[PDB]
Amino acid sequence: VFTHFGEGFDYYDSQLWEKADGWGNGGVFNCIWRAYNIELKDGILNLSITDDMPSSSKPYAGAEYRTRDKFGYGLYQVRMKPAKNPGIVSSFFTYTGPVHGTPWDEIDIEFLGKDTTKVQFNYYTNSAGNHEYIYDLRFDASEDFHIYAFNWQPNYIAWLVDGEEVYRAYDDIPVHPGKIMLNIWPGIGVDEWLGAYDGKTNLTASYDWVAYDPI
Ligand SMILES: [Ca+2]
């Protein structure tokens, strides 16, 4: 049963959100997620990359903040300001995966820190990705908060920036409802895509609010 969802990041409510803590995604993600790199202050969600704890398997600690609940077709909106640095990604995306008994379906707004005048849109449907599209913003997303969105329908996904649609994709669209997830992370083995990360300290992607409306 999907219903309006609104989140202002005023307070952490463990029934609604989950601070990812003590696992990483592996592969190209060169960090473990730490609940301590999530901060809610003055109504802004701050997700940071820092140096990880001494006994971590990775050099860096990221943050990922994720809804308890899952969401279906409709309009997903974020008001956010990604981080700028080579070799990192600041994200708003939906995700479900084999662990939850479904195919890996996911829809992505990724800000490649190497160049925050661009956004990357992408989606995975039954694990099949390779739908990358880089949209030129003609502003620097790292300097101010802006509103990014996708409207996910059975037959397409539309992405939008500051209220206007800028890209639509038709091919093999995701099916299974997913959690909303926000993250920031440094990459490894992907110098071509992200640039090399340079260990620059205390990068923060900030998020003013998120909304979902079943339409
Ligand atoms: Ca807010």
All domains in the chain, ordered by first residue: 1-215 (2.60.120.200)
| DSSP H or E segment with residue 208 | strand 203-213
Resolution in A: 1.9
Separation between Cα atoms, residue 26 and residue 15, nearest integer Å: 27
Q: State which approach was used to obtain the coordinates.
A: X-ray
User: Cβ atoms within 10 A of the Cβ of 127, count?
Assistant: 11
8 annotated as ligand-binding: yes
CA atoms within 13 A on the CB side of 164: 3
Whether 33 and 62 have beta carbons less than 8 Å apart is answered as: yes
β-partners of residue 124 are 106
Whether 95 and 183 have beta carbons less than 8 Å apart is answered as: no
208 annotated as ligand-binding: yes
What is the token pair recorded at 195?
């640039």
Return the closest-CA partner of residue 124 out of 166, 87, 171: 171
Distance in Å, CA 208 to ligand 1 centroid: 4
Residue 155 is given by DSSP the state T
Whether 67 and 73 have beta carbons less than 8 Å apart is answered as: no
Return the closest-CA partner of residue 32 out of 45, 44, 19: 19
Whether 88 and 113 have beta carbons less than 8 Å apart is answered as: yes
* Residue 188 CB contacts under 8 Å (≥ 6 apart), including other chains: 28, 29, 30, 197
Separation between Cα atoms, residue 135 and residue 151, nearest integer Å: 16
Residues labelled catalytic: 106, 110
Distance in Å, CA 108 to ligand 1 centroid: 21
What residue type is assigned to position 123 of the chain?
Y
Return the closest-CA partner of residue 108 out of 127, 94, 118: 94
User: Cβ atoms within 10 A of the Cβ of 102, count?
Assistant: 15
Residue 53 is given by DSSP the state P
Instruction: Return the ∠ at Cα 95 (arms to 94 and 96), rounded to 5°.
Output: 145
β-partners of residue 197 are none
Discontinuities in the chain (C→N > 2.5 Å), after residue: none
Q: How large is the greatest C-alpha to C-alpha distance in the chain, in angstroms?
A: 47
Three-state SS at 98: helix
What is the token pair recorded at 117?
């005048």
What residue type is assigned to position 174 of the chain?
P
Return the closest-CA partner of residue 135 out of 155, 114, 116, 157: 116
Distance in Å, CA 190 to ligand 1 centroid: 33
Separation between Cα atoms, residue 90 and residue 109, nearest integer Å: 8
User: Cβ atoms within 10 A of the Cβ of 129, count?
Assistant: 12
